[PDB]
Amino acid sequence: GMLEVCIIGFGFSAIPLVRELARTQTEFQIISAESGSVWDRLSESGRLDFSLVSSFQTSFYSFDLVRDYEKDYYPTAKQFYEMHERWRSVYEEKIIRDFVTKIENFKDYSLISTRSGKTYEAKHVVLATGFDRLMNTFLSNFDNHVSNKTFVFDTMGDSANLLIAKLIPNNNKIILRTNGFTALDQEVQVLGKPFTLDQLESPNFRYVSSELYDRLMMSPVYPRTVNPAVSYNQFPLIRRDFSWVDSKSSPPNGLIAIKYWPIDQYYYHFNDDLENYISKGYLLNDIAMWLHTGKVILVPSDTPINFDKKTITYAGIERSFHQYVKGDAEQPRLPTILINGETPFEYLYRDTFMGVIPQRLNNIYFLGYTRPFTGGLANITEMQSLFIHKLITQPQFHQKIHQNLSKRITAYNQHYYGAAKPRKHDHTVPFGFYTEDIARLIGIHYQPNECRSVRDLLFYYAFPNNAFKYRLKGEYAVDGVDELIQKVNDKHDHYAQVFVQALSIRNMNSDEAAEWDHSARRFSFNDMRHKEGYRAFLDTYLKAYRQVENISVDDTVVDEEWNFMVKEACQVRDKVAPNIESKDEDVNKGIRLILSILDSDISSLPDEAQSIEFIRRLLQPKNYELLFIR
Ligand SMILES: Cc1cc2nc3c(=O)[nH]c(=O)nc-3n(C[C@H](O)[C@H](O)[C@H](O)COP(=O)(O)OP(=O)(O)OC[C@H]3O[C@@H](n4cnc5c(N)ncnc54)[C@H](O)[C@@H]3O)c2cc1C
Ligand SMILES: NC(=O)c1ccc[n+]([C@@H]2O[C@H](COP(=O)([O-])OP(=O)(O)OC[C@H]3O[C@@H](n4cnc5c(N)ncnc54)[C@H](OP(=O)(O)O)[C@@H]3O)[C@@H](O)[C@H]2O)c1
Numbered sequence: 001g002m003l004e005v006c007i008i009g010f011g012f013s014a015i016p017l018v019r020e021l022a023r024t025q026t027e028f029q030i031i032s033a034e035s036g037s038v039w040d041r042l043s044e045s046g047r048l049d050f051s052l053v054s055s056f057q058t059s060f061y062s063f064d065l066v067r068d069y070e071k072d073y074y075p076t077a078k079q080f081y082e083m084h085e086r087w088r089s090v091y092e093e094k095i096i097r098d099f100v101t102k103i104e105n106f107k108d109y110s111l112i113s114t115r116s117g118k119t120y121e122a123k124h125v126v127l128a129t130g131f132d133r134l135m136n137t138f139l140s141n142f143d144n145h146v147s148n149k150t151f152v153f154d155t156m157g158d159s160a161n162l163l164i165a166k167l168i169p170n171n172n173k174i175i176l177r178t179n180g181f182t183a184l185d186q187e188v189q190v191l192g193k194p195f196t197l198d199q200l201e202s203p204n205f206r207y208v209s210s211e212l213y214d215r216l217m218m219s220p221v222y223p224r225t226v227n228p229a230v231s232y233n234q235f236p237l238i239r240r241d242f243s244w245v246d247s248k249s250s251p252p253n254g255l256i257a258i259k260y261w262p263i264d265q266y267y268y269h270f271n272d273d274l275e276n277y278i279s280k281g282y283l284l285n286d287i288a289m290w291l292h293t294g295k296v297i298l299v300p301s302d303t304p305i306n307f308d309k310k311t312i313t314y315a316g317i318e319r320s321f322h323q324y325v326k327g328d329a330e331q332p333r334l335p336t337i338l339i340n341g342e343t344p345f346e347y348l349y350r351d352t353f354m355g356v357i358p359q360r361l362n363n364i365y366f367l368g369y370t371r372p373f374t375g376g377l378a379n380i381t382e383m384q385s386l387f388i389h390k391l392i393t394q395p396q397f398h399q400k401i402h403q404n405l406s407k408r409i410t411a412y413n414q415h416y417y418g419a420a421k422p423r424k425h426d427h428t429v430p431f432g433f434y435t436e437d438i439a440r441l442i443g444i445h446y447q448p449n450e451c452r453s454v455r456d457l458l459f460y461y462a463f464p465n466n467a468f469k470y471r472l473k474g475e476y477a478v479d480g481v482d483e484l485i486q487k488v489n490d491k492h493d494h495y496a497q498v499f500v501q502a503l504s505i506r507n508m509n510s511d512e513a514a515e516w517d518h519s520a521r522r523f524s525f526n527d528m529r530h531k532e533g534y535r536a537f538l539d540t541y542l543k544a545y546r547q548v549e550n551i552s553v554d555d556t557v558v559d560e561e562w563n564f565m566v567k568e569a570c571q572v573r574d575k576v577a578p579n580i581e582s583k584d585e586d587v588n589k590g591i592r593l594i595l596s597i598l599d600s601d602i603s604s605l606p607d608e609a610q611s612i613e614f615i616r617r618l619l620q621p622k623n624y625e626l627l628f629i630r
Contacts, residue, residue: 003029005392006112006122008100008335009129011037012377013368015087016061016385017126018094020476024393029120030095031112037130039081041140048077050165051281052376053158053186053259055196057488058431059376062468066480069487072196074186076281104341105361111341124392128367129333135159138325146322147171147553152305152312155327156181156287161258163325164296165285169545171553173562174296175312175321177303180240182221183231183287184374186259188524190497191587194265198375200524202462202498203432206249207448207621214250215513216502220525221251224514228580231288231526234573237298238291246418249433251373253416254425259374262527263289263534271537274544284541292531293538294566315568317561329424332369337361349426350417353409353628354438356384357391357401365391372431375466379431382467383438386476390442401441412628432465439470440629448621454597455494457618461502462495463488493591494598500590503611504583519582529580 005021007014010032021028042048052059052075059075060068060083075083088095102113103125112120139159147170153160156178164174188195206213219225223232223239232238245252263286270277290296305312305324312319337345339360352358355370365388370380390397401408417426439445451457463469463485471478472485489495505513517523522530546553593608605616 002109003027003120003122005124005126006031006120007126007128008112009127010088010091010095011039011130012084013130013381014126014128016382017367017388018091019063020385020389026393028094030091031098031100031114031120032095033099034097038136038140039084041136042077043081045140047140048081049281050077050162050283051075052077052080054376055198057466058198058379061378061382062471062478062481065468066478066484069484071491072194078281100335102336102338103364104338105364106341107362110364124363124365126365126367126388127334130368131330132333133159133328133330134326135328138163144170144549148557149322150175150319152177152321152324153327154325156258157256157327158258160325160327161260161285161287164290165283168290168295169542170551171555171557173559174290176296176298177301177312178237178298179301180238182240182255182257184220184257184259184525185262185265187261187265189265189522194268195492197259197524198431199464199492200498201374201430201432201464202495202502203430203436203465204461205502206433207624208618209623210248210250212502212506215505215508215510218250219514219517221255224510225518227515227518228576229527229529230518231291231528234528234576235291235298236572237300244420244423246420247416249416251430253429254423255373256425256428257373258287260285260287262286262530263537264530267534267537274540275548278545278548288526288528289531289534289538292528293535294570297566297569299569315565317565319561319565337364348422350413350422351409353401353405353412354387354441355427356387357405359405359409369427370434371428373428375431379435379467383435383470386442386444387438408628415626415628435465435467435470437626440626442475444470444474444476449619451602451619454594454600454602454615457602457615458494458496458499461618462499493595496591496594497587500587500594503590503614504586506614516582520584528577
């Protein structure tokens, strides 16, 4: 009569697993802290006044999307929290409010200790406890009445970018003292229509060849184009050292990106009702517009600073600042876990299988410790939830995965990390590799060889690998996913543009593909040609923000020392930007060809002529093997 499952921590990550355990009537208990999460801190202090950096389709679960999806949008922080609270309310009767202090792991059960002193025995234990993040305080607590101060950031990430969005409108000057950072427009115009960047990744093209996929994806990350319109050419300090990368899989696991509103897309969405959109949490966070306008400056990583005087020395200027912001040492909130009830478990992402199954522990699973490169967490945690549910409820599956666990882990690490040493961001994966890897392990994947029509090929290769893609049919089918996929296909032209992109670069080398990617009137990422024209909009924006936030600040004060630092900062840009002056034309022809053979039988396509041949060979991709599954 021992408890079959104990889930520790209930916020967001645990929802889909609890839903599947309920469906199979598997006995479970949830234990979760009375104190809740950062989302409760932000709710309590009235600071749910921002929006997600991820699309609806990747940030909410399949069983919500089938009801509530009518169009792409970026949810607000308020909507995200409201959804956590709705699901909390569904499962509250299954939640014990307490805090787990210790887990003793035995051969086929665990002893869970709590701060109350109550103990629990459970055959299977799932940890969904999230992360402690140092920067959460800056969001939950730090003040909006600071003005004309200098901030120094040693780190750039989504949390820094959100703080910078809130600081800039109070004429706070931002110095970024960095080893580089990857920033990407969260939204792109494709023939007039907005696509979130997660929709453009067509990840199953990795199976055609890693080199094809690499030149399709990596030109905005690695400094491959000489095009003077690209932020990494106007502001070379943004470039990172990627010498650590030792994998043929691109983008590599361990690559992080900050996702941001470019001001042109911000204007297209919000220009009509600006004050009301800002009050909902749609905040302009265009880092490239900040670099362009000098409201942010980059300085070298080894730039000298004096923590005692609160001074940084740049442009022969000893420069004084109100705050230095170090940046996150973000790590899982794990209680002490005792192996054989004796030896403390040591957590390392790479030593777990798919970030879920730790070694040396029996029937313990980790849920929510894998971070998506792009898109929302929902895609990751939905698929992790199905994997965990199958391991808990199907001993045949549990035995299959565990029998060769150490060899699977080795084969995964070889494929994705190679000989690179563990890094603090190992837990970050391309979402469309991870979801597909789990789907193949579970057996709810699609087979490329079973596509019959060109349409079927578009769905396999070009429809994004969102978790709901794998819940149309088979073991984990969700009612309404058919109608969801239809709605999404109908609105994005079946992802024909994405498909044609790969068709267009199949013969190119990586340098040719990089130039082609940037030959558009507006390329997807970091296009500095689409900033100057929005300066008037920016002033309308700052006024609307100030008005929403009851701020007064006069834009007359002149920080001549800043100007000199900005001028020193923006010197490569003042050389390169005057040098300014195929993708659009090629895409147009490609989409015409594809939409016209949509319902054509693939296997029977005849021997633009050579693009049909390549299309036919997509039935037999030569790079399909994943040795951690086989
Ligand atoms: C500022 C911010 C912005 C974000 N923006 C986005 C976004 O745009 N898109 C997106 O997809 N994701 C975003 N995320 C990430 C992610 O969606 C959230 O971090 C989410 O809260 C993770 O859910 P979780 O359930 O893993 O953890 P949490 O939501 O933190 O919930 C875990 C729960 O477990 C409890 N707990 C912890 N330890 C114990 C213990 N020992 N015993 C008992 N209970 C315990 C905690 O109190 C908490 O209530 C953002 C995160 C932050 C902080
Ligand atoms: N769906 C999601 O899960 C999701 C998505 C987006 C945002 N978020 C939220 O926003 C936050 C984003 O992370 P964070 O701001 O807390 O800190 P972080 O991104 O974990 O840390 C950023 C640091 O990582 C290093 N880094 C290494 N490679 C980099 C690259 N290519 N680009 C940029 N930085 C790189 C840099 O420091 P060094 O160079 O000094 O090592 C940088 O300062 C999350 O904590 C989360 O709260 C969640």
